[PDB]
Design a protein around this ligand. Structure first.
Ligand SMILES: *[C@@H]1O[C@H](CO)[C@@H](O)[C@H](O)[C@H]1NC(C)=O
Ligand code: NA
Ligand code: NA
Lengths: 28, 251, 10
C-alpha cells in the first residue's frame, strides 16, 4: 500500500534534484 | 551508468545489488518489490552462451546500498535467496525476449529510510506513462564507460524512444516485451546503462499519484552510450501476469 | 570490495 513513496523524499515532501525533469517530460 | 551522476541518499531505496559470493563481485542490479521479493533480469542469472547459470546459494542480495564497494554498516541489509524463478519463455537463444526473473528472500527485509519497495504498474499507469519522449530514471553501479567503476550508485534520466526508431537502430529483432530509451544524436544530451547495470530498474514518477513505478528492467544494449544506439529494457507491465502468478503461487 | 560479515556467507 505504501509502495513507491520514499522515506527521505515523498514521505517528508522533499524533492530530489532531477525528478522535475521527469515531470516536465510528461506532457499529457 | 554512462553520463549520469551520483545518487542522493535514499533516492532509490528499492535498488538492490546482486552480489556474487565467490569471487566477491557485483553481478547485477535488481529492485525490491515487497519485503520478500526482488525483481531482476533473467540474463543476470541464466545466460548459457557465457556459461552463466547461477543457483540460489551462489548469490546474495544487498539492499539499502549507496557505496558500490563498502560494507555499509548499520544501513545496508544482506539477504539470502530462497528461490529463483525465471520466466519460462525467456529467450536467451536469440534476443533476450522476456528478460525477467524473480527472487524470493529467505526472510523479510526490514524497511528503513534506505530500504523501501517500488510499485509495479497497472495497465492504466503503463498506458499513460509509456510514451515516446516521456522520461524515466535508471540507476546502477555498472561501468561508467563502455571501455571505470563508480564509488556510489549512479543515476540518469532518459527519454523513451519511438518503437520504429528503436527497431531501426539495431539488427536484433525487437519484441513487444521490450522498449528502448536514450537520447538521439541530434538531441545533444547523453546517457545509458552499461555492463553491471543489468537487472536494475527503469522507474517513472506518476504525476497522478506521486508514486514511483518500475516500468522497465535494464536488459541489453550494443556497447554503451553510442550515438544512434539505445538501451533496451524489459517491459514490466507486459510481463506482470507472470509476476503475479509466481507471487500468488509461491507466496 | 570490502569484506562482509561472515554471518552472511554461512
Ligand atoms: C541451469 O542449472 C540447473 C541446475 O541447477 C539445470 O537443471 C538447468 O538445466 C540449467 N539450465 C540451462 C539452460 O543450462
Ligand atoms: Na532494424
Ligand atoms: Na545512444
Amino acid at each position: 500500500a505504501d509502495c513507491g513513496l520514499r522515506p527521505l523524499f515523498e514521505k517528508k515532501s522533499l524533492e530530489d534534484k532531477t525528478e522535475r525533469e521527469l515531470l516536465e517530460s510528461y506532457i499529457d | 551508468i554512462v553520463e549520469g551522476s551520483d545518487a542522493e541518499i535514499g533516492m532509490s531505496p528499492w535498488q538492490v545489488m546482486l552480489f556474487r559470493k565467490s569471487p566477491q563481485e557485483l553481478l547485477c542490479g535488481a529492485s525490491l518489490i515487497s519485503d520478500r521479493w526482488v525483481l531482476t533480469a533473467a540474463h543476470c542469472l541464466l545466460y548459457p552462451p557465457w556459461d552463466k547459470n547461477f543457483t540460489e546459494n551462489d548469490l546474495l542480495v544487498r539492499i539499502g546500498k549507496h557505496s558500490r564497494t563498502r560494507y555499509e554498516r548499520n544501513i545496508e541489509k544482506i539477504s539470502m535467496l530462497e528461490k529463483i524463478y525465471i520466466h519460462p519463455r525467456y529467450n536467451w537463444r536469440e534476443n533476450l525476449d522476456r528478460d525477467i526473473a524473480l527472487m524470493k528472500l529467505k526472510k523479510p527485509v526490514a524497511f528503513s529510510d534506505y530500504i523501501h519497495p517500488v510499485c509495479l504498474p497497472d495497465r492504466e499507469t503503463a498506458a499513460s506513462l509509456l510514451q515516446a519522449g516521456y522520461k524515466g530514471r535508471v540507476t546502477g553501479w555498472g561501468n561508467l564507460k563502455e571501455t571505470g567503476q563508480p564509488s556510489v550508485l549512479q543515476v540518469v534520466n532518459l527519454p523513451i524512444v519511438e518503437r520504429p526508431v528503436c527497431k531501426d537502430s539495431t539488427r536484433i529483432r525487437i519484441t513487444d516485451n521490450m522498449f528502448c530509451a536514450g537520447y538521439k544524436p541530434d538531441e545533444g544530451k547523453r546517457g545509458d546503462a552499461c555492463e553491471g547495470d543489468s537487472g536494475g530498474p527503469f522507474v517513472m514518477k506518476s504525476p497522478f499519484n506521486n508514486r514511483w513505478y518500475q516500468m522497465g528492467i535494464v536488459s541489453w544494449g550494443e556497447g554503451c552510450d553510442r550515438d544512434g544506439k539505445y538501451g533496451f529494457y524489459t517491459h514490466v507491465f507486459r510481463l506482470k501476469k507472470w509476476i503475479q502468478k509466481v507471487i500468488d503461487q509461491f507466496g | 570490495f570490502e569484506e562482509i560479515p561472515e554471518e552472511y556467507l554461512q
